[model samples]
Target: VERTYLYRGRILNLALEGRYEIVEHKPAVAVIALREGRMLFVRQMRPAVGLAPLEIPAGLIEPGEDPLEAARRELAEETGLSGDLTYLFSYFVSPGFTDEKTHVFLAENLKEVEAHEDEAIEVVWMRPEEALERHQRGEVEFSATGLVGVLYYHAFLR
Candidate 1:
């Protein structure tokens, strides 16, 4: 199939594959970090979404970085904490239009670390139950990573 780029940016490229619209996105990683009983989530304004949404510690896999390394890096960078990291799972963000897959992890026995400076993200510590409740009430929104982290916790951790 012939491919044509409609737009290209740092994180993704909007392209056409034959007659289908597709997005070529960098693969990402997310950490399902929990401390005590609260799940670690981050909230930052997303101009693209026009609102701040809850998300897990996640980012694009940097050049030459493996999924595990990216996972650890994203966790520490976003949350100012590091832990005994373990691979959990991965998923496609939206297969119908993009090739962005997020590899998720479980981080335990966390310890303090220097976070990335100057990030606007706010670390949100909330239990999965409360997070889900807020979502139901439309008081908060969730990104794919946040929803994944919450569901994973309920599925196995709770």
Candidate 2:
């Protein structure tokens, strides 16, 4: 299969294949923002899903921004919290059709500040176990990066 560029933009691309369209997305960052024992989460209405998703603070890595910096910036922007960040892991969000790589980070020793949240976002805090239970019971839906970050926390960090 040969890759053909159908269209390109600042952060994503649409490529044509024999009978398929591949989406190439820019690198992104996700943060597991923790304070004491609870992890910070964002419940935001996703226009595409029409349901609010419980997600970790995340955003695209800007053109010249480092992944670590992006993670810190997103965490602060979404949660109004800041902390010492430790690199967790990086992985491809979806390789089947998208080239989105997500850099996950763990932030602890958190301090909250005044943060402005858009109408679509609601900040939620839950312990790792509680978050896991919600995920299991389908009470909470996660974006790919959020799911993986929580899994990592449950499996290793905690």
Candidate 3:
């Protein structure tokens, strides 16, 4: 397969292979951290969407880090909380355009931890059902990871 890169930046690359365009992005990890029946969520400005969609704590898997290790770091970095982590599932962020796959995890038995910060994230905790309801009511929006977190809670954690 012949491929050419149109642009290469820090986090993502745009490329063309034959007649198709594809994005090469770093694989990421997300955490579904539940504490006292509330699910952890984050809201931060996303320039790509021009709005901040509520999402679970997530970040790219760094070099030499496995999914679980990335999940642990993302959880701490985004929420300043850590927990017992277990793998859940993974999926492509958008197969049609990007090759960004995100590994999901369930984080229980949470504990407070000291962590550094990131891009002005606002941490939120709410019942999964409430989050779903609000999304239905258009009171808040969700990134794919946030939607997956709510669905996973209903599917398995209930």
Candidate 4:
């Protein structure tokens, strides 16, 4: 499977299938942070979606960084919270178009600190059931990793 860089970036396609463009990405991580009876969430403006969406804290892994460290970094950056993190699961987000595998985790014993820099994040807290209800009613949208984290938490953690 020969691949070539297109537009001088991570976008490329297999030489055998020129029409199949793939977006390359580093591995990512998402955190499902729980405190008391509520789950921590973030509403952040996603330029790709053109609106802020409700999501678990997540980000791409840095070069040579461990997935668990990435998860904690993103959680602290976006939500001003940190905790005891346990790996839950991982999956490819949009395997058809991208090579991004997202690792999801469950974080307990949460405590708050200052958010990383001035990230445009609005912290949201909801019961596990309420978050599901909102999703069911279409009142909130979730990122791929966010949906996975929420479902895993509801089905197994809660």
Q: Which candidate leads the pack in lDDT? A: 3
Tell how far residue 30 is off in model 4, in angstroms.
0.4
- For residues 14-91, could you state the per-residue lDDT of candidate 2 as single tens digits? 998788779989899988876677777888878889988778888999878999999888877787778899997889
Which candidate model has the greater TM-score, 3 or 4?
3
| Total clashing pairs in model 3 | 0
Residues 1-158, model 1: lDDT tens digits:
78899999988999999889999999999998887899999998899999999998888899999999998887777777889989888899899999999888899999988835236878899999999999999999999999999999999997
Q: State how far residue 44 of model 4 sits from its true place (Å).
A: 0.7
lDDT of 4 by residue, 60-144 (tens): 8887789999988888888777889999878988889778788888898888876353458787887868877888898888777
lDDT of 3 by residue, 99-147 (tens): 9999999998888897556559889999999999999999999999999
Q: How many backbone clashes does candidate 2 have?
A: 0
Ranking by lDDT: 3, 1, 2, 4
lDDT to native, each model:
0.89, 0.81, 0.91, 0.77
Worst lDDT window (10 residues) for model 2? 112-121
* Residue clash pairs of candidate 2: none
RMSD of 1: 1.4
| Model 1 residue 112 CA deviation in Å | 0.4
Clashing pairs in 1: none
Better of 3 and 4 by lDDT: 3
- For all candidates, what are the clash counts? 0, 0, 0, 0
Candidate 3 off by > 4 Å = 115-119
Error of 4 at 38 (Å): 1.1
> What order do candidates take by TM-score, descending?
3, 1, 2, 4
